[PDB]
Every structure is written in C-alpha cells, then in structure tokens.
Structure 1
Amino acid sequence: KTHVQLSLPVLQVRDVLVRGFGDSVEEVLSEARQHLKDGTCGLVEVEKGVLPQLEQPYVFIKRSDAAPHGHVMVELVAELEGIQYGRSGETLGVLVPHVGEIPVAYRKVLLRK
C-alpha cells in the first residue's frame, strides 16, 4: 500500500531515551521508516526548547494534504544544519525511536510509505 494507518505514541522530550535515528540524512530517513513499519517510532511535539534537546539530523512528519478515517496524511522530511530534504506541509512533530517511554497521547496518521 502507498499509505499505512499508524497510531504514534506522543512522547515528552525529557523522557526520550534515544534522541534520534542516526548520523546522516539518508540513515535517519531509513531508520525512521523502519521503526514506523515495526511499531517502534514515537512522536515529539515541537515547541520552544524541544529540538536543541534532540539529536540532528532530525526527522519530521509533515502534513502532505488537507484526513481519511481521522488519520492526517503525512510524509517524512529530514533536517541537518538548517537544510531540509523533502518539501511538505505543517510539522506534526519530530520522530524518535520508541523504547517503552509512556506516551501522553496518540497521533493518528496516514503515512505516505
């Protein structure tokens, strides 16, 4: 399928144990997509002070369109040293590995895969 319905756990930034997916734009997009397929991906909502507490390169989920079955359609965009790789809509959050942190909410998305 070109899209997959996922329910992503929303994590508090200070709880996150593994603060990024790797060391290059290509690696973090690859790892993010793998963790989304495996059900081991969390989402941190971006506010003042969040991104400096996480590791670059960043992986964002961004709105791709204006929401089937309550799932916002999203795609992945990576960021390193102020340059983005991908072009998309509003940020829903920054993706991180999930390793058992307790979420505060879930974010239903339709991931362009």
Structure 2
Amino acid sequence: MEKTHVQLSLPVLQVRDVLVRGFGDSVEEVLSEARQHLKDGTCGLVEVEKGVLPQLEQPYVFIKRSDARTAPHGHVMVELVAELEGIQYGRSGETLGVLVPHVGEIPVAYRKVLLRKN
C-alpha cells in the first residue's frame, strides 16, 4: 500500500514560468490537490526569494523540513504546510519552497525529498 514516506525528485521552476500559480481556493483543497499532483508526478517547486509569493496565488502550499538530523539516501525529509492570509496550517521546519502544479515548464534543477505523505 502507501508507505508513510516516498522518495521524489521535484522539478524546480522559475516563478515567471509558472502557468498555474496555485492548487485551489481553500487550505484543505490546496493540500489535497498538492498531494494528488505529487502522486501523479505533476508537481513543481519554486524556491522562495523576495518577490515570489506575491507572484503566486493563495492559499500557498509549502514543503518544510520535518527533521534536521538526517537526510536518508540523499533526500531531505519534508512535510506539507499551507498558508492563507498569514496563518499556517501545520508547524514544521525550514521552507524548501512553494509547491505548484507542473504543466510542462522547463525546470532549472531538481530537489530530492523524502515526503511524508500525510
């Protein structure tokens, strides 16, 4: 069945290339859709710098580090946290980036993660 964590290599996208700038319209929807796109191989990652979040659509889905002691098989352990109007749904570690749908944009790198599914 579904293991608790899955190894994934996520394409890193530049913010100005992203065509679909979020996963939906509520905290529960964006987390659900993020998880579905991760399962389908159609999720990208944008690294957060000044100017990035105002160019994307709320609610946001972040991947954040879930454990800063080890990174098994060269993949950092992460979990999902959503944000709407400055309030976060989950508490976790440092942000690795914001997740968005991937619809064919050309990435600039890949980020290896070990994702906690739920």
4+ runs deviating over 2 angstroms: none
| CA–CA distance in structure 1, aligned partners of residues 57 and 116 of structure 2 | 24
Per-residue deviation at 1:64? 0.1
CA apart distance, 1:91: 0.1
TM-score for the superposition, normalised by structure 2? 0.95
Structure 1 residue 43 displacement after superposition: 0.0
C-alpha root-mean-square deviation of aligned residues, in Å?
A: 0.3
- How far apart, in 2, do the equivalents of 1:40 and 1:74 lie? 18
* SS of the residue 1:28 aligns to: helix
Task: Summarize deviations over 1:16-65 as a string: whole Å, max 9, x none.
Answer: 00000000000000000000010000000000000000000000000000
Deviation digits for residues 47-84 of structure 1, max 9, x if unmatched? 00000000000000000002000100000000000000
Q: Work out which of the residue numbers 53, 56, 72 in structure 2 matches 1:54.
A: 56
Give SS of 1:69's match.
helix
